[model samples]
Target: LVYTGKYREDFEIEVMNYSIEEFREFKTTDVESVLPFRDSSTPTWINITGIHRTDVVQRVGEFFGIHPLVLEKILNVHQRPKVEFFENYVFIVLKMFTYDKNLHELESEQVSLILTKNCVLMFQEKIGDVFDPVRERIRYNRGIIRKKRADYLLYSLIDALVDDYFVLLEKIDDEIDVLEEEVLERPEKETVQRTHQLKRNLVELRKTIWPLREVLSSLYRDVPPLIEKETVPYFRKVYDHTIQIADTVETFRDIVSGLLDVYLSSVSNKTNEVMKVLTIIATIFMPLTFIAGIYGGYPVVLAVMGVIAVIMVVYFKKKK
Candidate 1:
């Protein structure tokens, strides 16, 4: 398969620590310096925004005590959405979808979250992300996010990302509304192309979402110790969100498929109208051409052809 993601030169990696009293700390990028001041009482968050550098991944793998395979998968940006439990942490890979309004397209980047007892590590490629709000919650100590452990923080991240799906869905729904109108009023080449592209995108989304339910459901049902039982409901909550988005995507696919039908019917009717007009024009002159060639009856032919044209015009008017 073709890989859609590769490493980039510039990546944002940061270490955030939140004290038990209140969350606020920015430490150096060094794993050595960063790990010396941490314990299970305080929470640590390693935000890795770029996956292009091997050294970065190696360092992350080193500090987190991540497995070789997991580290390799971390660098493989095209990996499908999934969840797994390892010795040191629980690893979750999910997609962050972005909609391009002008291009009328959907794009996705894989976001990986590793949840440890007192720390969480996030890996992503895109500059703009949905986790900003979660960070905001922690920064201002707005919610329990700053008060709780890393599992809750992981929940916040997933919830924010899940909420993002709805935003993208709303845009898709808006596009579907206009697209339905276009199919009936004017289904051109571009309209068809868009419908197909939307169809393909929905199918891809379906493929991604099914695995997500199983992964999260397994997380909820299996209950890895990394996720406390108290946090399982949040996992359950996000699982429900996944189901909701999945259902919406299915409905949209059916709606877009109906749009395809309407577009085809529209083009078919247009073709028939053009064909009928051509037949009428041919009918009006057929006998006139014969009469002119056989008998040289120009005047008679002109009158008869003009009368035929008028009669055909009246017939067509009545037909309509």
Candidate 2:
């Protein structure tokens, strides 16, 4: 279920009335309180959207028995994407992203998930998500989501978040391709700006995805119990995808760098050609200027200058 804003107090009041079984079924609007119950049968998914109210979050933390340090990490909005497995629970932080339809810029949010035996709790700074397909899959019993344990559910959710990166990357690739053509034909200041922008995006993408490799690789290599043995293949696939995306990002970065170089070289070459022509013109006028200066110094100098000028003209004509 989705809890969009500060409804935690009311939610806690309602949940207090629930039996352990009812609590197992109960979904907390506050993300921290949505931890898995010890005796739950069916999987519980709790999503908390807004994180503005400290009291609400603290209450939820107290109810769930979360460590102060862990709650501190959750309360801080700027945590990097990572995974930490404790004795009783597993915590994962991931970056979720979408392309802004109007501005054509990428927007990102941090989402944290806590996974236990039969419960999966998700926290975000805002409501709504790109997990509609996951919800549909859960509702329809599509794929292995329905049959797998909570770890698999966590995998599916993380996979969905990572897949959004590919979508944004594809958009960026298309834009880069267009700018490449522009740069080749007639590079302009706007083209340079576009390339610079693409480079900046690559930097951002690298920062986000590089840590994820370690996070996912640790999940596979270290074999965290928070991830089921059967679910390893799925996470492995995501790990492979992340590597591929990283490679693509590097390739695109190199291409943009090369394009910038090509543009600068072309401009420099054009300037050189213009300068060469100007230099030749200046060389041709040097003799003429010398002849005029000599003739101005004396009367006989005019006769010598006239004869020299005729001779030089005839020599050039013959050479041509």
Candidate 3:
């Protein structure tokens, strides 16, 4: 059922394309303008927003000398965080995260980038752009991105992605804390559901972050000829963020594990309290039931039950 729904949505692909170079930026729907099929001294970024359209990606891949295998990887949205080096280009897969306020959940999408000597090809799953700040910096000539080559542009894009991981993690942290409180105070069905959901989301995040560290580590040292010596340190900085993110995720995993137990214990203890009171009430009524059966007058039964109930309750209180 889920795959059927996903397949239904996949056919609705609408391509959004744009290009960025040092001196100019342009948006286009045509692949020709987006890629231009040329090489120059200036570095270029060709961003395509819809990868479900396999034909468009295949055409661009063929034009740019990308391997057919790598093009297939680009079409696979379930690809893990990975980095592969070919003779002509370097290919990378990374996850981008966004928070859906309505669903109160984290949304993740696959991001792929192919880096060559003079151009960077970035592919996103859908229209929401996480690299808008990177775009702004390039458009205004505000920072080093406009001055650097394709390698540094790759760094800026990856850095923007890593930085946003912190934002999403912080949001996750806040929700986990809130769930912790709710689970402690009063754990109901929904509370358990939310706690499990949060843990599941964290697991997804760990899946992304763990492989990303390896990907960053490779980019730091292995792609020496393509990843410029000047750009290695920037990649190193991103590697540091990944390390930090990994540690934070591990800690939250531990906290969340502890929280699930807390919820279980709290709920069990509450059930025990309810059972304790119920047993006490039933114990007090036992003799009263016997006496009422033998002495059958309505007034007598009522008076005796009232007096006996009060005395039993008082005795229980005194014992406590």
Candidate 4:
């Protein structure tokens, strides 16, 4: 769940393929025809990492025969996470997230994946991503990716992104553990503030991820011929992850709420202890003030006051 904001986006195209093998890895300032598909047997990933211009998208869509409305949504960076099945292709949107320890905030961006029968157009909000591992898989032939079609490749990319949700959750869980201690032990005034921030982050995660489940759900239904039946199970796996991640998001929301309450209760209990000690000190001084005023001019009252002070000191020492 990313908050909407504009960035200085620029148009960029990266094309990569392995061996029935695929092709281009050039910075195309403009759109053009295919370089060479190795006989269209191997699927190519035409990844557009940002959207600084519209003409390039229009040209690419025209070249690839992408529907105008589909291209319109793809060019729109502020769209929600979703999956739409057209007669010939699959367009999916997902939220990508990163936690900045230095900034103490979440940086969320939208990812749109347009999987045609032969190629995938991957787009991110900014110029960066959470897909290096997938890149490695493609480069080193680390998995069955080289052997799979573009459908399976789409599965791999989306699967990698969705899987990282667990890693993100791990970070949240770690912070929750730290804040839980803060709430239970000595809580500062800032503890609740941090708890509420974490709660807000959970809400953001929920907004992005709940719709994400449906996106994966649309894939696993296996009706779309674009997503091969073999790849359907992988989408199912991703769908399962969406459910788990969403469930954890809900759980984190509840945990943060509880942490906030504990913080308030801890502060309340601390205030009560402070009030009790102040009351005791005032009670001890009350009679001292009374007697001093009662025998203001008497020398015996001075000796009597000293004895009373000594008795009170002894009583306090014993109590301690």
Candidate 5:
């Protein structure tokens, strides 16, 4: 059955329409509505959306002969971004994040990829994804996507996703640069929020990309049957890129943290300078008040006050 709204609804409808045994054969499609049931010897990709239906999900699992644990992962949406190697398959989870319309907040979703000798399966928690460009590449025969196996296709998808991180980081860098300039002139709470936000985004990005290092490294070091030996080089390149992105994120995080500290120090220094000026004025007035007090006892307070004020004014003027 075609679902126009939510997959959860479709799953509920499937429960009423078919027996649990029969529903176990059903499979869901990805946000792109592309299913991975290719007949060619070439690698296939079955993209699924709405993983909430255990029956539909189990049916897809049975069709692919996936392990129960893997199926459990598919149903659970909170798994960390990771890659797990099975006896016959590799399971990969990746987190994709984007800035909300406010352009200051980050929203994330989980994307799951399963690799086999002849097919690749992807499940997304939501519809509409960062993988649209990969879909276009696959459909249009762009790059090496058409020539490679499912593993290479998997690499292409992951590469495209990681590349998005770079694009987002650039945008963040631009925003931070503007904040830096603003801070140099006058720091504001918004500037502090911007700094905190940049650091937070980088931290989240680091968590996502960090595991990919091991995933790609493992791909290159021990060539999986699903991944071609020649393809390992491509994975290596991606690994290098992931490392660079990790480094960039860490560096930017440190810089933002340092900027926050500097802003605080600058504000503290300004406050101290104001206190020093007030203290100097009080110091100058103290002895003058004592002299005026004695002159008042001698019946010349007005004359004494005027002379002392004039003398202090001259002293400051000469000191300047």
Candidate 6:
């Protein structure tokens, strides 16, 4: 009932029903039609494309007997990634990340999942999503999803989320690599700015991913029959993958932290080279300057200054 999120005038609701033999997909704005598909024998995935519509969220909760707190969390888009077991279903909140190549930035959205005995309800903020692969697999019977139950469907979605997490991490890793090269070779103000920005990005990304490990941990640990024995191992696989991701994030953090220091040092070293050349010029000219100032012999002083400059330049080069 209490919604603290952005408002959208237009939204969509898509329902997909599939079994080993048959598959059906449809879109409806009507809440009444969504109820009958819930308790069907076929595994159903009800993907609500937008949650800004409070009326739709409330009616769906009423129809499915979703708990009030779960609905509240669904409406509140800022909820952290987590998992809570209810009497009738398992509720999960997780972040879906996508990199915007044009903007050169990482974008994310909060996705709420409700897994029931025969159906899975997915709440997304917008129309575009990362679930196309899951849909494709179910559509073509590309994998074991059609043969499995609703738990397997939930697993597929979570697996897809984690896989996309890896893709984003790879993108960040590549950015860090580019930053590293920039720090060592060029070390511009822009380079430091980018390094700091990426450090903050890693911190935010870590906040999004760290809790998911716990969510997966709880799924595999000991409690839920909703998560089947076979699906539990797949959760464990994603768990291991999450740990690898978390570790890589930490590694990136360390590298980025060091990059700032490296930039500072490189800039200082460049300044030192400039200062060293200026001082050598002044030193080479010191005696010639004294001779010119006191003796006032133009031609001889010019030759003497040139020879002294050349000798000192040779000495400096040999020492270097």
User: How do all models score by TM-score?
Assistant: 0.86, 0.73, 0.83, 0.86, 0.75, 0.93
Clashes of each: 1, 0, 0, 0, 7, 0
Query: Candidate 3: lDDT of 92?
Result: 95
lDDT of 6 at 233: 84
Which model is ahead, 2 or 3, in terms of lDDT? Answer: 3
Error of 2 at 97 (Å): 2.3
Per-residue alpha-carbon lDDT of model 2 for 158-179, expressed as tens digits? 7887787788888888887787
Model 5 over residues 1-320: C-alpha lDDT tens digits?
Answer: 22222336332111001111221123333322222343336556566666665666676677678888888877676556778888777888877778763568887777788887666777765666677787666656666676666777778778888888788788777777776776665667787877787777778777777786777777667766655657788878888888898888888777777877777777887888788668657766777677766644444766776677678667766543
Worst 10 residues of 5 by lDDT: 12-21
Off by over 4 Å in 6: 7-10, 102-104, 295-303, 317-320
Model 1 ranges with Cα > 4 A deviation = 1-4, 37-40, 226-229, 288-320
> Compared with the true structure, what per-residue lDDT tens digits does model 4 show for residues 155-227?
8888989988999999989988988999988577766777788888788778888888888887888557554
Residue pairs clashing in model 2 are none
Candidate number with the higher TM-score (2 or 6): 6
- Candidate 3: residue 249 Cα off by (Å): 1.9
Candidate 3, residues 1-320, lDDT tens digits: the string is 01101221332222122234426666666776655633755677788776766777887888898888888888777768999988878899998887764466777778899888677888776777578898777777777776677888889889999999999888999888788889889566778778888888889889889999889999987764455667899999999889999999999999998888998888888888888788777878888888877754678778978998998888878643
The most accurate candidate by TM-score is 6
* RMSD, candidate 5, Å: 7.8
Best-performing candidate as measured by lDDT: 6
Give the Å shift of residue 295 in candidate 6.
5.0
Q: What value of lDDT does candidate 1 attain over all alpha carbons?
A: 0.77
